[PDB]
Amino acid sequence: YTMSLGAENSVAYSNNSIAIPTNFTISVTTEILPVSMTKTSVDCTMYICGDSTECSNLLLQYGSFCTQLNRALTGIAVEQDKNTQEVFAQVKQIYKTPPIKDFGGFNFSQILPDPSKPSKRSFIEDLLFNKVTKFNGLTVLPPLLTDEMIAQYTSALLAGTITSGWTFGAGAALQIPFAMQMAYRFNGIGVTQNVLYENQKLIANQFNSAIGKIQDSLSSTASALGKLQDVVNQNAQALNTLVKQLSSNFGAISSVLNDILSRLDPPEAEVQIDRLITGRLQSLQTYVTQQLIRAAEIRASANLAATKMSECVLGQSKRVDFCGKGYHLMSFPQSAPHGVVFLHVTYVPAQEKNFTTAPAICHDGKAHFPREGVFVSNGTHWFVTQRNFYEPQIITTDNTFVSGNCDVVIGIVNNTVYDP
Amino acid sequence: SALGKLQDVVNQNAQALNTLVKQLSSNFGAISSVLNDILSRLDPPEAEVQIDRLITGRLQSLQTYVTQQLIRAAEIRASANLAATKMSECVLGQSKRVDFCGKGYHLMSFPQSAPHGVVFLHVTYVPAQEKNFTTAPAICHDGKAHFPREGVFVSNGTHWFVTQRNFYEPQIITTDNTFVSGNCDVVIGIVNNTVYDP
Amino acid sequence: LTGTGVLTESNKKFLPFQQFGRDIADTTDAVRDPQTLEILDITPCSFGGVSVITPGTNTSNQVAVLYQGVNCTEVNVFQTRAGCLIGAEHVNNSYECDIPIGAGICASYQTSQSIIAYTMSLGAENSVAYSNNSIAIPTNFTISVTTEILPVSMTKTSVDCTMYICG
Ligand SMILES: *[C@@H]1O[C@H](CO)[C@@H](O)[C@H](O)[C@H]1NC(C)=O
Ligand SMILES: *[C@@H]1O[C@H](CO)[C@@H](O)[C@H](O)[C@H]1NC(C)=O
Ligand SMILES: *[C@@H]1O[C@H](CO)[C@@H](O)[C@H](O)[C@H]1NC(C)=O
Ligand SMILES: *[C@@H]1O[C@H](CO)[C@@H](O)[C@H](O)[C@H]1NC(C)=O
Ligand SMILES: *[C@@H]1O[C@H](CO)[C@@H](O)[C@H](O)[C@H]1NC(C)=O
Ligand SMILES: *[C@@H]1O[C@H](CO)[C@@H](O)[C@H](O)[C@H]1NC(C)=O
Ligand SMILES: *[C@@H]1O[C@H](CO)[C@@H](O)[C@H](O)[C@H]1NC(C)=O
Ligand SMILES: *[C@@H]1O[C@H](CO)[C@@H](O)[C@H](O)[C@H]1NC(C)=O
Ligand SMILES: *[C@@H]1O[C@H](CO)[C@@H](O)[C@H](O)[C@H]1NC(C)=O
Ligand SMILES: *[C@@H]1O[C@H](CO)[C@@H](O)[C@H](O)[C@H]1NC(C)=O
Ligand SMILES: *[C@@H]1O[C@H](CO)[C@@H](O)[C@H](O)[C@H]1NC(C)=O
Ligand SMILES: *[C@@H]1O[C@H](CO)[C@@H](O)[C@H](O)[C@H]1NC(C)=O
C-alpha cells in the first residue's frame, strides 16, 4: 500500500476564536544516544604475516603503513575514552541522596541506585544493561571508566539535580525543595507556580505513572535500545570481516603462510607472500578507513549527547524538541552500555477548549492591551487567562496597560475594565 | 600548554607531510627507491614493471594521505562551525545555553585571534558565599494564598522576606511582588504570615 | 599442518572419520595424533602487547611495564583487568587519576619516590542537607573569565601527482 503521512485534520481557524487548554499531562520520554565504542587494537604485523621473520622483512619494504594504522587505532581509542569522559565526568563533587526521601510526592526510587547489589545501578540501568547483548592479532582494550564508575557518575548527577535544580552546574550546589524546584521549572515555560502548588498531587501521580509505563515498556519490548545494538552489530560485522579476510588467496597458492613457507623456497614464495601482504594490507586499510568514519560519527553523537546533558540535566533549555517533545521541564540521565539514556520530563497541555478572543478592549476611548495573557470570553463575559492554562481572571488595570487610542487596532471589542 | 589543540593540529599536519615525503624512500618490492638508478640499470621490459610497482605504491600512499586529510578537514570544519556558532551566540549576543560559553551564567565573550584558530574570553557569573535559610511555598494572610511573582520566600528565623533567586536581597513582603490565587488549604507547606499593603 | 602453539588435552569428541579440526573463524584449534588416537587441542602461544608507564624524565627515570591480557604467569607484580603491571605497587588509598592504565586503574609518581597503582577517585564526596524547608541563597558572587581554544582552519597544501610520483 501507499504510506500515509498522518491523520487528516482541519484546524478551525478564525479571527476571533482561540483555543486555551484546561488541563495537562506529564510525559516522560526516552532518547538513546551512542557515546563510545569498543576500543579495539589490531596488531599490524601479527595480522598480516604472523610470527614470520621473512614475511615481516618483506612487509617492511612498504614504508610506515604499520605505524600509520597503529597510530590511527591509538587515536581512535583515546577519542572513545575522551568522549565518555566529557559526556559523564562533568560534575566536580560526587553527591548523594539523603535517607529521607521527602521529595513532595515524587518517587525516584526506580532511578536511584540501591545498595542491595554489587554494582550500584538502578532498576532502569539494570534493565538497560540486561537488554543490550585473544585472536589472530585482534585484541579489545578495556575502557578507562568502568560501568560502576559510570553508574556512580550518573547517581551523583541525579542527586545533584534533585537537590539543586540547575545551580550545581554554574557554581556550587544550593539546597532547595523539589516542590519549589518544580515551581521554578513551570515558571520557566510560562505556567505560573500556583498551578503546581495546587496540583502537586496530580503531577506526582502522573510522573509515577509515566515512570511505571517506562519500566513496563523496557521490561516488555527488547528493541528499545536500537542505535547501541546497531553500532555493536556493525563493529562485530567489521571484526568478523577482518578475520575472514585471512582465508583468501588473493592470487597466491594458498592462504596459509606457514604452508607456503614449508612448500616453496623463499625465492619462489616471495611472490605469494607479496600477494598476501598486499591483499591483507588493502583489507586492513579499508577497515581502518571505515573505523575512522564510524569514530567520527560516534564523536559527533557523543558531542550531541554531552550538549543535551549540559542543556537538559544541568538546566532547563528553551530549544524546541531538544530536551524531548513538548515543553521541557527536567531530564534524568541513565547509564547504558556504550551510550547514555535521558528521561525527558515534558509538559503537554490537554483538554483543549475554544473561546472568543479580541486583541484589546476599549473602555473609555483608550485601548487596553494585556501585559501577560490573552483576553478570552465564555460567551457573555470577558476574562484574561494564561496562554498554556485556562485560568480566567477579572480584567483589572493591573493586568492590562493602556497605549494610545483604540481607532487604529482592527478587531478591538468594547468592554468595561475594573479599577481595584 | 595553553594552546594545545592548535599545536596538536600543527603537529599532526607536520607528521602527515613528513610521512608523505618519506614514503618515497621505500621500494614497495622493487629493486630500489630511486627511479633514475632503475632506469639506468634495468632493461626497459623489467623497468616497466618496476615503474608500475613504484607508481602503485606511491599512489596508494597518496590516496591514504588524501583520505586522512579529508577526515581531518571534516573535523576542522565541524570545529569551525562550532566556533562560528559560539561567536554568533555569545559575542554578538547573550546565550542562555548552560555550559556552552563558560561554566556559569554567561555575560559576554571577547574573541581573540590565534594561529589557525580563535580564542574566546567567556565572562561568566558565578555565585559564591551562600547561606542556609528556611523557605515556604506560599503564605496566607487573610485566608488567601500569596505567591511571589519573582522571588523566593526566605526567613532568617523570626521574620520572612522575599529575595532574588541568585542574590540574597531581603525585602519586606508586600502586595506588589505577590499575587493571590486560591486559598490556604490547597497547598502543602504554606506558613501563616503577614502581607503588607502600602 | 605446521605452526606454533600449546598442545594440550581436549575434552571434545572427534568422529571416527574426522582427523583435523577447525573453529568458527576458520582456524585449526584441535588435531588428532598420527601415532596414537589422542585429541590434542592447539591453543595459541602466549602473546600480547607491551605498554610502558613512565613519568617525565625531569622527575625520575624509574619506569613500569604493562603486559596486556596476561595473568602474571606467562611473562611488585599486580593483576588488573587490563593485564599485569610489573614495576608499581598497589596501594589501598584512592587518589586522582594521573596516568590512565585501564578499567579504573591509574598510576602516579608519589614519594621513597616510586611508581604506585591505585583506583581513581571520581571526586570529593558531598551530601547536600536536603530538606522540605531549607534553601541556600548566595550572598556574593565572583566574575571568572575563562578561555576556550577552537581550531578554525589548517595549512592549505597541494601535492602534484606527477611531480610526486614520476619526478
Ligand atoms: C486532568 O487530567 C487528569 C488525568 O491525566 C485528571 O486526573 C484530572 O482530574 C484532570 N483535571 C481536571 C481539572 O479535570
Ligand atoms: C515508590 O515506589 C515503590 C515501588 O513502586 C514503593 O515501594 C515506595 O514505597 C514508593 N515510595 C514513595 C515515597 O512513594
Ligand atoms: C467552539 O467550536 C464549536 C464547534 O466549531 C462551536 O459550536 C462553539 O460555539 C465554539 N465555541 C465558541 C466559544 O465559539
Ligand atoms: C461566563 O462566566 C461567568 C463567570 O464565570 C458566568 O457568570 C457566566 O454565566 C458565564 N457565561 C456562560 C455563557 O457560560
Ligand atoms: C473575521 O472574518 C469574517 C470573515 O472574513 C468577517 O466577517 C469579520 O468581520 C472578521 N472579524 C474581525 C474582527 O476581523
Ligand atoms: C464601542 O463604542 C464606540 C463608542 O462610539 C462605538 O463607536 C463602537 O462601534 C463600539 N464598538 C463596537 C464593536 O460596537
Ligand atoms: C548549611 O547546613 C549544612 C548542614 O547542616 C552545612 O554543611 C553547611 O555548611 C551549611 N551552610 C551552607 C552555606 O550550606
Ligand atoms: C492562619 O490564619 C488564619 C486566619 O488568617 C487562621 O484561620 C488559620 O487557622 C491560621 N493557621 C495557622 C496554622 O495558624
Ligand atoms: C531577622 O531579621 C530581622 C530584620 O532584619 C531582625 O529584626 C531579626 O532580629 C532577625 N532575626 C535573626 C534570628 O537574625
Ligand atoms: C517536612 O518533612 C518532615 C519529615 O521529616 C515533616 O515532619 C514536616 O512536616 C515537613 N514539612 C512540610 C512543610 O511539609
Ligand atoms: C588467572 O588466574 C586466576 C587465579 O587462579 C584464575 O581465576 C583465572 O581464570 C586466570 N585467567 C584465565 C584467563 O584463565
Ligand atoms: C564578595 O567577594 C569579593 C571577592 O571576590 C569581596 O571583595 C567582597 O567584599 C565580597 N562581598 C561580600 C558582601 O562579602
UniProtKB/Swiss-Prot annotation, chain B:
Residues modified by glycosylation: N132, N156, N192
Top-level taxon: Viruses
Chain coiled-coil ranges: 7-51
Phenotypic consequence of H159Y: In strain: Theta/P.3
S-S pairs: C90-C101, C140-C184
Function: Subunit of the fusion protein that is processed upon entry into the host cell. Mediates fusion of the virion and cellular membranes by functioning as a class I viral fusion protein. Contains a viral fusion peptide that is unmasked after S2 cleavage. This cleavage can occur at the cell membrane by host TMPRSS2 or during endocytosis by host CSTL. In either case, this triggers an extensive and irreversible conformational change that leads to fusion of the viral envelope with the cellular cytoplasmic membrane, releasing viral genomic RNA into the host cell cytoplasm.
The protein's name in its UniProt record: Spike protein S2'
Origin species: Severe acute respiratory syndrome coronavirus 2
Biological classification of the source: Viruses, Riboviria, Orthornavirae, Pisuviricota, Pisoniviricetes
The encoding gene: S
